[PDB]
Amino acid sequence: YDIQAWKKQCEELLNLIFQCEDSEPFRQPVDLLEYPDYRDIIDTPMDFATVRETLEAGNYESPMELCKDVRLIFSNSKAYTPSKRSRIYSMSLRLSAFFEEHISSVLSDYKSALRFHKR
Ligand SMILES: C[C@@H](CO)Nc1ncc(Cl)cc1F
Secondary structure (H helix, E strand, O other), X not given: OOXXXXXHHHHHHHHXXXXXXXXXXXXXXXXXXXXXXXXXXOOOOOOHHXXXXXXXXXXXXXXXXXXXHHHHHHHHHHHHOOOOOOHHHXXXXXXXXXXXXXXXXXXXXXXXXHHHHOO
8 A cells, every 4th residue: 555656666667678679769858850850740758768767757757647648659659660560669568568567556556555545
């Protein structure tokens, strides 16, 4: 029932994501010199360094907010991909599955802790 536990759990999950090779295209903002039309398709860029920095600055109030930004990294990759078979998009699907598998307990524990707080 620790209402604050999600933060370190998210830091550790981001550490695992950064250790994974599949995260390399998503660790920093998409390079507009490499993909000059990126902002014509993507309205809200997002990357794992921005998520980590937001978390470390104390600018997420809940793990749901962090989860919304991580999911935006994946939806941007899906919206920008020219093919559902593309390399970068394929890496995003594996990273997404790993992220969802691990964030589920973080979200559950946080929501359970908040319900206990308001019992
Ligand atoms: C924790 C690590 C242990 O080797 N396994 C993984 N880490 C990251 C991804 Cl995206 C997929 C994995 F299977």
